[PDB]
Amino acid sequence: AVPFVEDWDLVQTLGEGAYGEVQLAVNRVTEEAVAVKIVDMKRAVDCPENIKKEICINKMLNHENVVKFYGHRREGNIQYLFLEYCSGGELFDRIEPDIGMPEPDAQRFFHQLMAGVVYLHGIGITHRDIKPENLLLDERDNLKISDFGLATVFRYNNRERLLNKMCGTLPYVAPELLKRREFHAEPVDVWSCGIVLTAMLAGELPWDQPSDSCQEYSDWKEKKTYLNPWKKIDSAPLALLHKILVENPSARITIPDIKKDRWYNKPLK
Ligand SMILES: NC(=O)c1ccc(N[C@H]2CCCNC2)c2cc(-c3ccccc3)[nH]c12
């Protein structure tokens, strides 16, 4: 860390998490910028194995819609992960509160989100924490899936396993996480993509949690799309949301069928 900081300026904090923080590092000579995730392993006993997993998963990734991993190094009880600096910031800050963003921008980001998710699923990795705060943008507004601290392997070669960890950010979690002891990985990530799409189109999350005790979730199950956030959403993207935000994960739309959706394929302004 000491020789690195002699040549690289840790200009500012980019973000904070339970792990620690992400800093913007700029080389004094070349002016190259790198995001440096700093993790204090002392914050948990499981942390060395946890960060080893995030590092291991990061080593497997190579795709245009996934944040590039350069390497890592341990300095005492501190872990340093070196990542592609995504200068467009978080997708979250492209979302105007209670408004969202223009429909063509939401469509383009959603296509890039699907490309990234198809790639992860194809190598047997599930993210488990898809949300606008974990979707970054590069200097050309290309979406990059970020933050693999909760990611895990769901398929070993051509053999799937069921997951059982109640993972992620509650307004983004699929209802089976509160109903089933074990469940398929891929429909969980599909559900969270549907929540991201809802947020991009309406600038609002539809519910605290997808429970029958949550009124807003009951309203959706009852097709009350004349209520917020749904009433702000045009019928074409809402028809896709009706297929994604399906309670039973076995009846939920799969990504190959999202790719056949009319709004997904719709040429917009
Ligand atoms: N690899 C990066 O570039 C990076 C990694 C994590 C980042 N935050 C974390 C915060 C917790 C939730 N998940 C994201 C940011 C935030 C920024 C940024 C860039 C440009 C402008 C404004 C913010 N960049 C990053």
Neighbours of 243 (CB within 10 A): 16
What are the CA-CA distances from residue 205 to residues 116, 194, 213, 226, 235 (Å)?
22, 11, 17, 15, 18
Instruction: Name the structure determination technique.
Output: X-ray
Task: Note the resolution in Å, 1 decimal.
Answer: 1.9
Q: What is the CATH number of the domain that holds 190?
A: 1.10.510.10
Handedness of CA 85, 155, 53, 250 (dihedral sign): positive
Show the ligand 1 pocket: residues with CB < 6 angstroms: 14-15, 17, 22, 35, 67, 83-87, 89-90, 133-134, 136, 146-147
* CB crowding 209-235: b at 16 or more within 10 Å, else e: ebeeebebbebbeeeebeeebbeebee
Q: Please state the domain count of the chain.
A: 2
CATH of the domain at 34: 3.30.200.20
SS (H, E, C) the chain: CHHHHHHEEEEEEEEECCCEEEEEEEECCCCCEEEEEEEEHHHCCCHHHHHHHHHHHHHHCCCCCECCEEEEEEECCEEEEEEECCCCEEHHHHCECCCECCHHHHHHHHHHHHHHHHHHHHCCEECCCCCHHHEEECCCCCEEECCCCCCEECEECCEECCECCCCCCHHHCCCHHHHCCCECHHHHHHHHHHHHHHHHHHCCCCCCCCCCCCHHHHHHHCCCCCCCCHHHCCHHHHHHHHHHCCCCCCCCCCHHHHCCCCCCCCCCC
Place of tokens 């009852």: 222
Question: What is the spatial distance between Cα 142 and Cα 140, in angstroms, rounded to a whole number?
Answer: 6
For residue 101, the cross-strand partners are none
| CB-based contact 131:90 (threshold 8 Å) | no
Which amino acid is located at 128 in the chain? R
φ/ψ of residue 213, rounded to 5: -75, -20
- Give Cβ neighbours of residue 38 (< 8 Å, ≥ 6 apart): 20, 21, 22, 23, 78, 79, 80
From the candidates 40, 129, 147, 212, give the one annotated as an active-site residue.
129
Tell whether 1 and 38 lie within a shared domain.
yes
- Domain residue limits at 182: 97-269
Among 80, 96, 112, residue at a domain's last position? 96
Contact 150, 167 (CB under 8 A): yes
- Nearest C-alpha to atom 13 of ligand 1 is from which residue? 134
Quick check: is 129 catalytic? Answer: yes
253 CA to middle of ligand 1, Å?
30
CA 264 to ligand 1 centroid distance, Å: 28
Ligand 1 closest atom vs CA 17: 11
